[PDB]
């Protein structure tokens, strides 16, 4: 089965040949489509699309299903890379899960895969319908897709969400590998070979493309740059949200060219390839997780702790329509996401789970009322595979991570006697911006604060941020205290006094909850707006 040499370009020719495109058509070569100067019926269609899909479906419906993405702008070593015939490139089953996807976006995903994926690799495309309502996604889709011969639609009759749908897809797949894609993606040139070649080399590797943004408003594709730019890897924050960060210096040094894998603490988890056998062996997904949320983080910890590796291959580029809001209904509310996170925290995070429970009150409650369900199959899997503990994961996989204290001196919320609202970090804050007052919700999150031995008031979900005194509005800034060497600057040291005032040690002034932004004022023990409760949840 194992031949000498490298696959030829003829051996790699795609399943379907892209027709030469009209260069002046809308969205051509992946450039912006500006949908402006619309008549009254058109402006109606656009708002209907935006509100159905939480992307500009009006734009998507006017762009070819066949659009090229212009010239291949990947690094030169990616365009030149050859693939050995031994071990052979494995076959793949493409699994696209959808729930009420637009036609234009679902079929541009399917067309993209056929135009960019070598015929010799592409065994089948499985479309998993998670109980879509739209009639066009029933018989119309079944019939349209027959022409392609290798495309099958599988139906999840009752809405069970993305996790159950992927397990359904996997159970019918016969490929040697599974490649998962969302239903609003577009494959770049040569995206598949580098994923599948890496699994051929190392079958415990779970590999992701370097995911590109497709703009939800204009459908512009963010193209790779040829000169070794800043890459992102996946992380988690201590609310267990997926996030992106710069690579550390040791990884830049280790990677000699762009064909080298990037080791990633977490993966976005929509777009990746895996050995089918390894997917099953390493515990596929927790079947009790519902709708959306947590499974990518759960899979990240489980792969790493149980002896696999999570990798991003920058020679593999796939565009994704990133949204700001879900279009999806939640049959039994968004509590589902928090239950999914408690399930992964109980199984994988050991003592570190308490750091998350403190920051998401809803999760602390689910633990206390034991409504997160039976995890005995997940516990059993962690034992049978002899997976390492979370201390090992933080040390060996994510040594760069800020880890809060397991048992901080104090955590909770800051409630103002005067106006009966809570100190809130606001919608968007990672440096610089003033804070707000917001209704006390007791949920933690944006109202979460810790008190340190060194008199700091921390907001430490993502970064180690410290309440930072100023002549005007109070800020969150990076703590200057970060262990052995360093100290705590007076602008970040506070005393909660007997009169319930918050007294900054540097400025000798008191936090008031008056105005839009809490600021420092002359200390007035009779001012209710300078009186703070440090409430525990």
């Amino acid at each position: 089965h194992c031949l000498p040499g490298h696959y030829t370009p003829v051996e790699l020719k795609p399943f379907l040949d892209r027709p030469l495109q009209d260069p002046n058509a809308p969205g051509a070569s992946g450039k912006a489509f500006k949908t402006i100067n619309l008549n009254s019926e058109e402006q109606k269609e656009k708002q209907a699309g935006e509100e159905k899909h939480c992307f500009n479906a009006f734009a998507s419906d006017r762009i070819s299903l066949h659009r090229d993405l212009g010239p291949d702008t990947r690094p030169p070593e990616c365009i030149e890379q050859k693939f050995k015939r031994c071990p052979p490139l494995p076959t793949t089953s493409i699994i696209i899960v959808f729930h009420n996807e637009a036609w234009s976006t679902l079929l541009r995903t399917v067309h993209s895969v056929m135009y960019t994926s070598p015929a010799i690799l592409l065994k089948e495309i499985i479309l998993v319908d998670d109980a879509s309502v739209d009639e066009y996604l029933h018989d119309k889709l079944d019939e349209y897709v027959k022409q392609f011969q290798i495309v099958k639609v599988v139906r999840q009759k009752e809405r069970k969400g993305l996790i159950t749908a992927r397990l359904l897809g996997a159970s019918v797949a016969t490929g040697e590998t599974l490649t998962f894609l969302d239903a609003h993606c577009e494959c770049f040139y040569g995206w598949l070979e580098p994923l599948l070649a890496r699994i051929a080399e190392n079958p415990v590797a779970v590999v992701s493309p370097d995911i590109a943004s497709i703009d939800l408003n204009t459908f512009e594709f963010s193209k790779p740059s040829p000169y070794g730019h800043s890459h992102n890897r996946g992380n988690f924050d201590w609310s267990l949200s997926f996030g992106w960060e710069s690579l550390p210096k040791h990884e830049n040094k280790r990677r000699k060219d762009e064909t080298y894998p990037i080791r990633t603490p977490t993966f976005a988890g929509g777009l990746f390839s895996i050995s089918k056998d390894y997917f099953e062996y390493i515990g596929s997904y927790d079947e009790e997780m519902e709708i959306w949320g947590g499974e990518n983080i759960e899979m990240s910890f489980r792969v790493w702790q149980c002896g696999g590796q999570l990798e991003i291959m920058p020679c593999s580029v796939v565009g994704h329509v990133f949204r700001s809001k879900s279009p999806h209904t939640f049959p039994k509310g968004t509590q589902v996401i928090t239950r999914n996170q408690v399930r992964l925290a109980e199984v994988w995070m050991d003592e570190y789970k308490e750091i998350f429970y403190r920051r998401n009150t809803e999760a602390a409650k689910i633990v206390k009322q034991k409504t997160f369900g039976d995890i005995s199959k997940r516990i059993d899997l962690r034992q049978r595979l002899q997976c390492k503990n979370f201390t090992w994961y933080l040390s060996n996989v994510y040594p760069e991570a800020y880890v809060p204290d397991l048992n901080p001196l104090f955590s909770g919320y800051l409630k103002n006697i005067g106006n009966r609202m809570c100190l809130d970090v606001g919608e968007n804050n990672h440096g610089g911006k003033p804070l707000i007052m917001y209704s006390c919700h007791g949920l933690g999150g944006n109202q979460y604060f810790e008190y340190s031995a060194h008199h700091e008031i921390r907001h430490n979900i993502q970064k180690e941020l410290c309440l930072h005194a100023s002549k005007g509005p109070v800020q969150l800034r990076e703590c200057t205290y970060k262990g052995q060497k360093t100290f705590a600057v007076g602008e970040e040291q506070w005393l909660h006094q007997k009169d319930q005032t918050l007294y900054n040690e540097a400025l000798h002034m008191c936090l008031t909850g008056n105005g839009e932004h809490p600021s420092l004022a002359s200390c007035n023990p009779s001012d209710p707006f300078q009186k703070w409760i440090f409430g525990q949840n």
Binding site: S213, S241, H320, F322, K325, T334, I337, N446
Partner: peptide, 14 residues
């Protein structure tokens, strides 16, 4: 009263 970071239920872009 937002129940999470604004409009969660989506993966953030890079």
């Amino acid at each position: 009263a937002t129940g999470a970071g604004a409009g969660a239920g989506t993966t953030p872009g890079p």
